[PDB]
């Protein structure tokens, strides 16, 4: 229930990335990937390099696309 | 020698149109598009771009800008001064 | 996986995206038939139109330019000109249908887990002809921009008109065909921009 | 694996505790994009004085708490009192007052980027009727913001 | 009974038909019409269409929309939204001593000087409006800004519609 | 309870692009015209060629998208006037986009005559009750 | 998959509201392709003023609901009324009256390209019994069209 | 039903692709193809170029005959 | 070089002749003809052509119209002041 104790929901207004409640009021929750998200936390590694670069390995060493070794994604 | 100006790509990415040959890029966490032609991303969008660092940049009459630069699953950007990321798929 | 205490189909999509992108196809053809004349009164190719039937060439702008070649050095601009496309004859004006009609072509060529992932095929496909929309409008607003800043830059004296040499012959032919009134139309010299900053001329509105 | 909203606000919240705020008397208006509340200097402060009661500090985490619910880039505050002895002994008490209100609600975590204060004194009344003292219904605090996207 | 254009900007007679249908009772036909004729019910239906009522200290503002209650881009009064109107001039009847104030606000698309046109032909559309229907000419006055001080957004669809608007102010 | 006053009918995000992309459109016109009215005062307006008597009041609303010399005909003849054509019709055809409403049939002639540009001319000789369509002199 | 018909058009429907509208009052004829609709000014205006009457849009309705059954290029509404003070003031009225009437015609859905209003004032009478008011037969107002392919 | 409430279907004349009725009116049915239809929505692609170039592709693209690729009738 | 005139055959396709060695084509919506010879159409009408361009044209006395062009499974025309299209069949 995103428009709750209201009219319920309207349309997707797709130039702030929002729902439109059937009052007047703009809607909490999100319609498109293109909305304004404070993103913080973020997974994946070889993160702040590259990225994780293609190859397939003998051994479990991950190498990111600058030449770094991560050592969180290698196998012990 | 004298380096070279610019590339005149950018003024296609300034327009919306994305480069001959390139695959598009899936964003998420704000207003951005993101192409890949040549291991190299093409972004445009209006906020500023903090982390990462850019090879060549332009700049629309209207607020646009255009970055050219290397290819990064994340972006670091600020918004209204606020500080916030921006997820880059399908590299 | 986790704490540790606590240590101690594919088809689907396929083919709801197939329907989801014909049915987003649809419903755009509808909405861009709905408002066929305001389109018309927008984007209209026939009044920027020159003189001979000469469609205007297409100019790109930049500003506040940099690059980073390499270290060391930098190289930086403050406002850079491109011409895109040149100028031609032409018989007919351009139409927005040719940038922003999508194709449609009715596909009739066709449960635990089979519901959501057809479902989530469904939002895909409309997530793909929303992207392939968006391009075709970026290519159309590109096209009309450019042929606007055309105009602009020949108001201020930064382009050249194209110039155009016309022939003209009497009654022309042999005792099996003749042809009355003969005119050989040929465009000599095209836009391009000058280099001569001297000959610029401003704009101050009040 | 995105979110959905944004954390830690429903509509379903913002209706009940505007509903709320304005049946207790804290006047809670909205035109367009743009927020204000209206509290009556009665209901936080004693006598004439920047001295907050122990009691009103309830009332400001309600307020707080109604803040949290939105997005926004600025927030003012704005003071306004009533005629006692000098236009700079006014202007002296409503920004001590405004500062006062403002550093409990930035000392709460709004997330909000500027926060404004400014005591106007009494040169803007919203009622003819001026007999009382803190009691009048012109001797307030306003709150206005703007909802961002 | 009524007649649907502007009832021919007479008072209308609206208890006394309640009050003789609902006899075939007398108190029961007066509750509903005192009922029915209070400030509160009034302002309930003007919420019912789309018009807002802000009241703050003495200052009452009114605030409707052109783009339900005009022609399109035109200066014309769209006749079918003719129950809000009345409804308006029905709750202005319960002031007759305080000024009116009545201002015509557009949207950020187009010139600057057909803003303010678009602005001011719809105040005084408005204006007029309010003067044909028993308030003397020297308690009105109209002003049209453009996109001066918006309420909203206009970088987006439905900030940019919540900002045409008319504003209706009295003491 | 809580209401703001305008709620209309739902939206398409196709029309919302494409009313983003047609603001810019119209601004840059916007621009583009103040820039060239800058640059060249126009001197003379075309009432001195196509003046106005009496019939040429009755009022018409007319949408079209073809060609000048049908409209242009249909015109002069809901006036009550001659038509007359000058000069050799181009091979490639001069076409023109009217949308109105109820206006006169004067600022008719004087719009189609406006929007033609380079290419054909409108007089209205009212002593002989003559509406003329001339081409012009170039290929 | 072509279509069979010209859309939301009938043959049974046209000859029914050519009856109904007969037996009502509003004379409907037909001469070769040429078609006039023929109105009285009393069912359509006040008593010589250009202000319609609420219950005339139900048969300004009934009339744009005949009118979408043909294929047209251009209508013809031309006004004419009886003389009361001048001929300046009856050409001003029979204008504005065509000017109303060709208004709301443009308003609903006909698929015309080019709609041509005129008033002639009193200039062409079809009864020589000029006794009435708006109430005389040749005060009305005249649409005619000729039906294309 | 073409000449409903009418004398029936004299003949279809070809000059203007219509039926005639018993009567003296046109009728609203169409006769031939050469008809003036106001056609405004078209089915298949390729639309505003030349048309499916018509070679057998290994893949599931669709070319155009000026280059064009449709990515509507393109399989994923 | 002097350009070429014109193509003969734009005056039998004004007459109605269709060009020998050609294939008929399938034209709905309108009064038109077309003609597929070297992979061009051929087209006779009375009415206007405007979207799809094309390479050669000719009129007759009567306002008889002959296009030469690339061909194109759809036309834009103009009636009477309205905009319609035809639909070109067998190609």
Avoid at chain 3, 1 to 13: I, N, P, R, V
Avoid at chain 5, 53 to 65: A, H, K, M, S
Avoid at chain 6, 37 to 56: E, G, H, M, Q, R
Avoid at chain 6, 88 to 106: G, R
Wanted: include cysteine; aromatic fraction near 8%.
């Amino acid at each position: 229930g995103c428009c709750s104790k209201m009219g319920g929901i309207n349309y997707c207004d797709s130039s702030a990335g929002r729902l439109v409640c059937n009052n007047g009021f703009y809607s909490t929750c999100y319609c498109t990937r293109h909305a304004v998200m404070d993103l913080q936390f973020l997974m994946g590694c070889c993160l702040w390099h590259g990225g994780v670069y293609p190859q397939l390995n003998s051994s479990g060493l991950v190498v990111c696309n600058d030449g770094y070794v991560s050592e969180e994604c290698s196998l012990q | 020698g004298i380096p070279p100006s610019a590339n005149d790509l950018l003024l296609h990415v300034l327009e919306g149109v994305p480069p001959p040959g390139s695959r598009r890029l899936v964003v998420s966490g704000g207003d951005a598009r993101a192409w890949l032609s040549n291991e190299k991303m093409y972004v445009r969008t209006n906020l500023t771009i903090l982390s990462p660092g850019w090879l060549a940049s332009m700049t629309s009459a209207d607020g646009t800008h255009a970055y050219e630069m290397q290819k990064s699953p994340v972006l670091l950007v600020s918004w209204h001064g606020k500080v916030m990321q921006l997820k880059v798929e399908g590299l | 996986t986790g704490s540790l205490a606590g240590l101690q189909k594919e088809t689907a999509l396929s083919v709801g995206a197939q329907a989801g992108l014909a049915w987003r196809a649809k419903i755009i053809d509808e909405q861009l038939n709905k408002q066929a004349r305001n389109l018309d009164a927008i984007y209209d190719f026939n009044s920027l139109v020159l003189e001979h039937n000469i469609l205007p060439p297409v100019l790109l702008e930049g500003r506040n330019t940099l690059n980073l070649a390499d270290a060391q050095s930098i190289r930086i601009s403050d406002r850079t000109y491109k011409v895109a496309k040149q100028a031609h004859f032409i018989t007919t004006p351009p139409t927005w249908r040719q940038y922003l009609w999508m194709d449609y072509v009715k596909p009739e060529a066709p449960k635990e887990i089979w519901c959501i992932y057809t479902e989530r095929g469904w939002k895909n496909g409309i997530d793909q002809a929303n992207t392939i929309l968006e391009e075709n409008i970026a290519r159309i607003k590109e096209d009309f921009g450019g042929m606007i800043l055309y105009r602009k830059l020949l108001a201020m004296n930064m382009v050249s008109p194209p110039y155009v040499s016309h022939t003209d012959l009497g009654v022309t032919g042999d005792g099996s065909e003749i042809h009355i009134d003969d005119r050989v139309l040929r465009i000599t010299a095209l836009p391009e921009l000058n280099v001569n900053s001297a000959e610029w001329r401003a704009a101050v509105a009040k | 694996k995105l979110p959905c909203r944004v954390d830690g606000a429903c509509d379903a919240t913002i209706i009940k505790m505007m509903t709320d705020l304005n049946k207790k008397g804290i006047k809670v208006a909205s035109v367009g994009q743009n927020y204000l509340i209206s509290i009556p200097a009665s209901a936080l402060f004693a006598d004439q004085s920047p001295r907050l009661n122990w009691a009103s500090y309830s009332l400001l985490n309600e307020i707080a708490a109604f803040l949290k619910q939105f997005r926004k880039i600025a927030i003012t505050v704005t003071s306004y009192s009533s005629k006692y002895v000098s236009v700079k002994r006014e202007r002296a008490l409503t920004l001590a007052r405004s500062r006062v209100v403002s550093e409990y609600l930035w000392s709460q975590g709004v997330d909000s980027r500027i926060i404004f204060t400014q005591g106007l004194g009494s040169d803007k009344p919203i009622t003819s009727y001026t007999l009382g003292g803190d009691r009048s219904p012109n001797a307030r605090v306003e709150i206005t913001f703007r909802r961002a996207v | 009974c009524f007649h649907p254009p502007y009832n021919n900007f007479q008072p209308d007679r609206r208890a006394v038909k309640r009050v003789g249908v609902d006899t075939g009772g007398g108190t029961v036909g007066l509750v509903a019409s005192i009922y029915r004729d209070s400030k509160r019910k009034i302002i309930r239906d003007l919420q019912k269409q789309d018009i807002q009522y802000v009241e703050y200290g003495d200052t009452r503002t009114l605030i409707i929309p052109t783009d339900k209650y005009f022609m399109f881009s035109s200066p014309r009064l769209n006749e079918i939204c003719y129950p809000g109107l009345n409804n308006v001039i029905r709750l202005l009847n319960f002031y007759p001593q305080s000024t009116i104030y009545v201002a015509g606000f557009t949207d950020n698309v187009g010139s600057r000087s057909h803003k303010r046109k678009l602005s001011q032909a719809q105040a005084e559309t408005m204006m007029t409006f309010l003067w044909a229907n028993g308030i003397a000419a020297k308690r009105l006055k109209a002003e049209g800004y453009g996109d001066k001080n918006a309420i909203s957004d206009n970088a987006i669809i439905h900030g940019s519609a919540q900002n045409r608007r008319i504003e209706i102010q009295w003491f | 309870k809580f209401k703001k006053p305008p709620i209309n009918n739902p939206s398409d995000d196709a029309t919302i692009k494409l009313a983003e992309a047609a603001v810019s459109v119209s601004d840059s016109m916007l621009e583009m015209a103040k820039v060239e009215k800058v640059i060249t005062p126009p001197s003379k307006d075309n009432t001195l060629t196509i003046p106005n008597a009496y019939n040429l009041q009755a009022r018409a609303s007319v949408d079209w998208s073809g060609p000048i010399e049908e409209l242009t005909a249909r015109i002069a003849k809901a006036a009550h006037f001659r038509f007359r054509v000058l000069g050799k019709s181009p091979s490639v055809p001069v076409l023109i986009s009217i949308s109105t409403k109820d206006e006169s049939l004067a600022e008719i002639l004087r719009d189609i005559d406006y929007q033609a540009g380079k290419k054909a001319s409108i007089h209205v000789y009212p002593n002989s009750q003559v509406v003329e369509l001339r081409y012009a002199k170039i290929y």
